[PDB]
Amino acid sequence: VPFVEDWDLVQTLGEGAYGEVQLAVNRVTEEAVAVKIVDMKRENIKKEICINKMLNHENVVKFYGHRREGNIQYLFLEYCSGGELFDRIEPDIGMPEPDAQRFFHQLMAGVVYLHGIGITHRDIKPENLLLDERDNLKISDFGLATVFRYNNRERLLNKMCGTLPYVAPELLKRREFHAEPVDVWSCGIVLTAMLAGELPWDQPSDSCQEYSDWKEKKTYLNPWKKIDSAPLALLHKILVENPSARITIPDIKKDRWYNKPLK
């Protein structure tokens, strides 16, 4: 309560499942901080805090701290004044290829970082990728994040949490699966949306005709026909159904378009 004495909760920045994100500005210094408010009596809030404590990287939203007031949790986060990546994507169009390439490089740096410390995000999508005042990408919203590697010993995951058009096909087919290829797949869906302004399917299942179309290499249909051959060839390696055959991030960093000078 003494916080709201000195800090103005200026307005709502977004709505999550358990509550809102508010912009807080200090009436004296004018410093701005984002306040995620979560109702424990309604994403896993205990783990979110716990995972946020581990993170220190230029492409992850910085966590300052938290507190509990009754049943309500408050997370204090760096304010990313550039907003969601989602709002840089023009519906049915996307954004310029150089912008998409730069964002994707920054997505990869943030994802390499998380996986390096054995964390998987599990909900990668444009709504969970924020931009700072220099348009640097910041991975956000760790409510579905979990540890997949303990020191140097991996475990397989089994939770089908995640936003369905971004979910890898193994989540609908296998009872357990490796963490890292799931994150690589959602990144591919993000790249597709950036380049075309359009998600390719509701869900990566056999019954979905748009998924069948992609499996059958019908790249003359939307969204694929709007995408240049070079970035498309990377997408061909990422949106690979068998997660064991799917491109890894060290191999993404060798891809021709990935390394292509544009503009």
Ligand X SMILES: NC(=O)Nc1sc(-c2ccccc2)cc1C(=O)N[C@H]1CCCNC1
Spatial CA neighbour of 142 closest among 66, 45, 72:
45
Question: Smallest distance from the beta carbon of 148 to ligand X, in angstroms?
Answer: 22
Q: 15 among the known binding-site residues?
A: yes
12 binds ligand X (CB under 6 A): no
120 in Cβ contact with 114 (< 8 Å): yes
65 carries a ligand binding annotation: no
Six-digit token string for 99: 């912008």
The answer to whether residue 14 forms part of the interface with ligand X (CB under 6 A) is yes
Q: Pick out residues in 131-190 that bind ligand X (CB under 6 A).
A: 140-141
Span interacting with ligand X, options 74-82, 145-153, 220-228, 230-238, rule CB under 6 A: 74-82
Size of the site for ligand X (CB under 6 A): 18
**Which residue stretch of 73-81, 88-96, 148-156, 177-185 sits at the interface with ligand X (rule: CB under 6 A)?**
73-81
Q: Which of 8, 123, 202, 255 is catalytic?
A: 123
With b meaning 16 or more CB within 10 Å and e meaning fewer, what string describes 11-23?
eebeeeebbbbbb
Instruction: Please report how close the Cβ of residue 30 comes to ligand X at its closest, in angstroms.
Output: 16
Query: Residue 18 CB, nearest distance to ligand X (Å)?
Result: 11
Q: Was 36 annotated as part of a binding site?
A: yes
151 sits in the region (left: phi over 0; alpha: psi -120 to 50; else beta) called: left
5 is in an annotated binding site: no
Please give the distance of CA 207 from its chain centroid, rounded to a whole number. 26
Is 24 marked as binding a ligand?
Answer: no
Q: How far is CA 260 from CA 97, 230, 253, 263, in A?
A: 11, 9, 11, 10
Residue for token digits 């507190």? 67
Q: How far is the CB of 77 from ligand X (least distance, A)?
A: 4
Rounded to an integer, what distance in angstroms lies between the CA atom of residue 126 and that of residue 115?
19
Which residues, 34 to 63, sit near ligand X by CB under 6 A?
34, 61
Cβ contact 97:262 at 8 Å: yes
Any known ligand binding at 18?
yes
- Are the beta carbons of 27 and 9 closer than 8 angstroms? no
* Catalytic residue check, 123: yes
Tell me, rounded to whole angstroms, the distance of Cα 212 from its chain centroid: 25
Q: Which CB atom, from 13 or from 191, has the smaller least distance to ligand X?
A: 13
Q: Which residue ranges make up the annotated binding site?
A: 13-21, 36
Residues interacting with ligand X, by CB under 6 A? 13-14, 16, 21, 34, 61, 77-81, 83-84, 127-128, 130, 140-141
Give the residue numbers annotated as catalytic, written as ranges: 123
